[PDB]
């Protein structure tokens, strides 16, 4: 059955639907499909990343039942954790800068988590500080950043759920640090040794690439053409981050050629773009 | 077995949002409650697998072709997930609107490449509808006809995942889908009790219920709160009447509701406060 019935919204974290383009991709090109995150706001491969951590902490003692998670923490990372949490059941305290974050705060805040707004002055340094200080001070259990060294089955499990056990030919990401992505392609390697990674970028700033196949850059204009073209060919209004991802999947898709398979992902829905010239018309 | 879905096509999304359990705000000696997350697609309702099915009937039966156009009026939250639809569908859509219809609602519908007709503000819903039925008339458009069939049934219990409830629970909206569902509810488990909720002031319906606006805000926080799922004041007045619905059933039965809406919708509003 196409409506799945599910016991818990948990189920749901980082396992949005992948669907296939099928009118914008070259008929010589591998497939291109696309990991839907934007539809669910706990929907990304980095949520079902961050329950993995959650689980493991519970499994290792660190975090017992109706304890404390504190996060230094923004954007739709904070908002998938809140989700993440209140799906868990337990109290989430974000920090945050007080200039970061105006209204996606109150989405944090419907899932109740606790923000702690830090000065202006400080910036992610004085929300790092106050995050920690909670840790020593109150005890709260810290997620360890992705990104950092210092399990890895579960979290390639995990990583297998949110790609609905789908090993790709290739797989193309947007990065912040390249953590999340060095993660996937460290899952993926493990099903397919030849599965290759491509990190996404707009056209310092220093990848730590011992994952990846490629960096590839893409074009503002591109990304917003490729969305638009995606928005009304494919009826998925998808983001600029999304509409860049599916270009840079085309490109891969083009050289990998018919019969393979590229997954791509799409972080942002069209919504977020309503002020751009994405919707001009 | 797989809770991420691999899929060829879009259009089977279309109305197949997932049905959730709610683990923590309903009594144990309830019925349980099972909220269809319709927000959570943009084309996620009932409504549009009903849009979809009338679509497919239109195909099956020739009243729309290849390279055909579907033409339909709109007003209020209404006309984006039909948009959708027909982007998924391959098919020219033509909208017809009040010109005081939301400039967000109409790029969105425009971003799924819909032509919009802008029909004059103050003849409101009834100068769109004219437009549409002047459009059919002039240019042998298709109509789906969702404002004020077997295939049908099958499709809206597709969009139940097959799953048949006690009870179910929806806002009243125009009339078109709440009459559909509990049509096609009935044929499938002739005991199915269908509330049809209204804000507080046909055969189909078998209670009317009145839930406030204070209710449901507060109904939609706790379900933030408790559940992690962030719904909407019309999702949280179903949630209420589902509730109340479900302590009269008891243990061991099920209620369905629906979320039409998530709380980003309503940062403006006393949803809100912290």
Same mark, same amino acid.
């Given at each position: 059955? =196409? ?6 919204? &948990? ?27 934007? #539809? +669910? ?11 993995? @951590? ?11 039942? *109706? $304890?404390?998670? /504190?996060?230094?923490?923004?954007? !739709? ?17 974000? %920090? ?5 974050? &105006? ?8 899932? *109740?988590?606790?923000?702690?707004? %830090? ?21 709260? #259990? ?5 990104? !950092?060294?210092? =399990?890895?089955?579960? %979290? *390639? ?13 290739? #797989? ?5 640090? $390249?953590?999340?992505? %060095? ?8 099903? +397919?040794? +030849? ?15 011992? &994952?990846? !196949? ?11 053409? @490729?969305?638009?073209?995606?928005? =009304? ?11 860049? +991802? ?15 398979? /590229? ?15 994405? #919707?001009?018309?």
């Amino acid at each position: 059955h =196409h409506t799945k019935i599910t016991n818990s919204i &948990v189920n749901l974290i980082g396992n949005t639907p992948i669907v296939k383009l099928n009118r914008v991709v070259p008929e010589d090109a591998a497939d291109v499909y696309v990991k839907l995150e934007f #539809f +669910n706001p706990g929907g990304s491969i980095k949520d079902r990343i961050a329950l993995a @951590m959650i689980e493991e902490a519970e499994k290792a003692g660190k975090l017992q039942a *109706g $304890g404390t998670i /504190v996060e230094p923490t923004s954007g !739709n990372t904070g908002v998938g954790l809140a989700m993440v949490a209140a799906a868990k059941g337990y109290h989430l305290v974000i %920090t945050m800068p007080e200039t970061m974050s &105006v209204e996606r705060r109150k989405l944090m805040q419907g899932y *109740g988590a606790e923000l702690i707004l %830090t000065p202006g002055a400080d910036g992610m340094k004085g929300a790092i500080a106050k995050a920690e200080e909670l840790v020593k001070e109150k005890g709260y #259990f810290m997620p360890m950043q992705f990104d !950092n060294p210092a =399990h890895e089955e579960t %979290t *390639g499990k995990e990583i297998l759920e949110a790609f609905g056990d789908d090993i790709p030919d290739a #797989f193309v990401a947007g990065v912040g640090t $390249g953590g999340t992505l %060095t993660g996937v392609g460290h899952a993926l390697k493990k099903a +397919n040794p +030849n599965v290759q990674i491509y990190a996404l970028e707009p056209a310092p700033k220093v990848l730590d690439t011992d &994952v990846y !196949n490629g960096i590839l850059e893409i074009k503002s204009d591109d990304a917003i053409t @490729m969305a638009r073209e995606v928005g =009304h060919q494919e009826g998925i209004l998808v983001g600029i981050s999304a509409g860049a +991802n599916i270009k840079g999947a085309i490109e891969v898709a083009k050289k990998l050629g018919k019969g393979k398979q /590229v997954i791509t992902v799409a972080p942002d829905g069209g919504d977020r773009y309503l002020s751009t010239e994405l #919707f001009n018309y």
